[PDB]
Amino acid sequence: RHTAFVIPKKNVPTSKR
Amino acid sequence: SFFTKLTADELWKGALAETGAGAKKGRGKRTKKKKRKDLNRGQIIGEGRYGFLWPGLNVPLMKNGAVQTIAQRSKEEQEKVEADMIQQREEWDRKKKMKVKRERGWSGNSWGGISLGPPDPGPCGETYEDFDTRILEVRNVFTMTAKEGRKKSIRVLVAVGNGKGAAGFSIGKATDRMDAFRKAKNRAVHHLHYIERYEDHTIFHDISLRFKRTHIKMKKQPKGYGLRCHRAIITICRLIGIKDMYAKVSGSINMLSLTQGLFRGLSRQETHQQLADKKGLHVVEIREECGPLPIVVASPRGPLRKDPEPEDEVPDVKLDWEDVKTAQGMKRSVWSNLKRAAT
Amino acid sequence: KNRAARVRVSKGDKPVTYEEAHAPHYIAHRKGWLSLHTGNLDGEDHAAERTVEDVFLRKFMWGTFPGCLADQLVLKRRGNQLEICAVVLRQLSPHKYYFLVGYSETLLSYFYKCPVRLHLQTVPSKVVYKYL
Amino acid sequence: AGSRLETVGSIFSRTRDLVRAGVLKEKPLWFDVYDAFPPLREPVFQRPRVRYGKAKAPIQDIW
Amino acid sequence: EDSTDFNDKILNEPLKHSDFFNVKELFSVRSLFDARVHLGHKAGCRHRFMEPYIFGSRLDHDIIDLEQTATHLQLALNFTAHMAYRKGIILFISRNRQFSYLIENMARDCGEYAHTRYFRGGMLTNARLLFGPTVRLPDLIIFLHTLNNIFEPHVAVRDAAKMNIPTVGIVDTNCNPCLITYPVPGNDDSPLAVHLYCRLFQTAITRAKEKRQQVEALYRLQGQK
Amino acid sequence: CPICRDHKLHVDFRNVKLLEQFVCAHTGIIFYAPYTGVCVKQHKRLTQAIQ
RNA sequence: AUAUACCGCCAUCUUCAGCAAACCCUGAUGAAGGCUACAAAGUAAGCGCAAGUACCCACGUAAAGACGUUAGGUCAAGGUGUAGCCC
Ligand SMILES: [K+]
Ligand SMILES: [K+]
Ligand SMILES: [K+]
Ligand SMILES: [Mg+2]
Ligand SMILES: [Mg+2]
Ligand SMILES: [Mg+2]
Ligand SMILES: [Mg+2]
Ligand SMILES: [Mg+2]
Ligand SMILES: [Mg+2]
Ligand SMILES: [Mg+2]
Ligand SMILES: [Mg+2]
16 A cells, blocks of 8 residues: 555644744 | 552553654654544543433533432433444544545655645735645655764655746755655745746747756647656646647656756747847748748847848758657657557 | 653643743742642641642542643642632533532542632633743 | 746846746836836846966957 | 826836936046046956956056946936835945945935945845844845955845845956846945945935925825816 | 446537547547547447547 | 563763754755854754852852763553463
């Protein structure tokens, strides 16, 4: 079987000054 | 005992062994990786094995305007809640295990030819919804260090295009493959080329360049010929918008030199208007389909020259043996002119 | 290297609390104590019996308010009384909070033969000190 | 967007094409001024090379 | 419905005249010859792309043809004056410490910006991080000295082309004018010449800025009545 | 294949709109099977309907 | 049974001073690399050092001491994954 790779949901920056 | 009990986080942290020496330097097989499961997902506060109904917690506080009292489910009724809870667990597990259908690229396990979508929108109200990203190469490069030793890094080559003459490529280097796709994709829109197209479907003339040790000989073709070129070139050409063209790669088949050389030769091609302005003459197109009719595709904006170009009995232009050998029926190859799929 | 009561640095997306962001060498400099009794003062007794009560209370409240505790408990003892102070999330309905308060207060008073009072302070989301 | 290919073409050519392709929604402020009052030479990058053999500079002495 | 008239009358109208701000009366070939704008470096320092502008080499001292400078300087002053009329951000760059004070003062005098200090890598190609996402970069960079202190091209010449910023530059006989959009060939060492350049660009800018206030008042006054 | 996966696509000589997808619009040549991916049986039925 | 599945608590270099996300640039868009103050492409959140704090001060001693290294130590603190025993 092929390696299963799908685009992961983009993260949102948590730390803001 | 009850004082030797930990929490789920401590139990899963030690059971998964995600942070350990084995993970650090490719010392652990991924064939059967352990996977974290949340055992509190489908649990209701107040539901136990005895089947007790606690007013205000498990069940509504008041029924028919009166406060309920402590009640306990019957054996038959409590056994139906356990089986319905199990079905929910299996349903949840089954959906997660199922894999959504995927679209492969050049090969099943090859990253090349896979789309990464449009580049991320810019902060100052910039969007690239008309652009498309396609992976060309994903390499795993290693580097010896003093402390860690042999650490793995990813090099990614991507191309972006809007389908209307604008296209560019970039390189992304990172430790995670998903971070290399973003860098290359978002950096390729700031290094865009504009490729000129003849009638919006092909190049203006035959190109034959060499980047370092890679040789690329492209040819102009009529409508309906299709793309008969290296698979990487077919990915870029769709991004640019070139429907019909033939290309042959010789020498080194390095993807980065083939990519950097293709954009170089496709940007240095002279159009028919430039040729007319440069020589102050009419560029006339002759077609067998249209017979002897002369079609003027470009005319000089400036003063038209009254003197014709001196006819040359024989032209001292360097020829290619591969092309002369084909026109004279001498290039025998059991791999040329093979029936293939539409590109 | 030392590990005790330390949250190792991460890429930057891990949110830690004030209590969780300080190691043991700050327990009397930048942090207080989660429990306050007299057992450990000079000349006092029953330090081993107050400790077992604290270890049980933290586990009882953690499993009795599952997913609702934003931060660690602050246990207070004044004479006979025992005061449990907790910060809780607002996800759960108030009806269930009042039920668990009347159930937990009563059960722990008959188990430790003492008047037990529980003081909840709801917060929208887990207060974040910094991102390690 | 834009294009940071300083070697490829000139700012006018790179901006003229991208504006016509659609990438640039609005052309830059200077663009109109350059087309109307352009310079004598298009500012295209060129690599300096060394003269070899008998090639010499045209510079003459002022006598 | 009212913007088209405003744009056509104000912005397009100047672009229809060869010398809207009349910057050809600000200088002359004799005004440049008296400021030693024709004196270049020695032949051994000469750059190969400045040969077209070299009248000759008198005793191994390149002489810059002022006939071309006047034609090259007219296009720069007009372009510089038009960008100030459009309320563009003009940045003066120079790494010659001798004239650093003079250039900074002129920029303040003409309501423009200067950078005569060490150019930190990323001012232009990374301004979002350094200044902020909503930062506005210069619309015109004027190079009074295109070389740095180790006799190499200023990094901003290459960085201004990456950001598609038009550059104006005073190139000497040992300078590279290939990426400079409007290059003026002249001496960049003598203090009598740098005072001229500064006075000319400062005059063209102040005129253009005052020329737009006259065109707007007429439109505003005429529009009401 | 494209013709066998959809049972509502009928290779008939009256269905000119479907037969135009298997003929080049620039050279008037019927594509070979590997081009479109149809089987030999349906490519032989298209050619007869196209002729 | 396996510390060569781990958490947990540590040793060691550390009687160190560096680690590093995210960008940018160079090298023809190769692995790679990134300083010169009369300055020449680097900017940097965060962690650490530092600073604070404790003990009799500003001193000193404690404490602290990152990322990594040695599959370092410990399944016999306790817990635990896998495998095994259950008259
Ligand atoms: K360990
Ligand atoms: K153990
Ligand atoms: K075990
Ligand atoms: Mg396969
Ligand atoms: Mg130690
Ligand atoms: Mg000079
Ligand atoms: Mg070990
Ligand atoms: Mg001290
Ligand atoms: Mg110590
Ligand atoms: Mg310290
Ligand atoms: Mg070992």
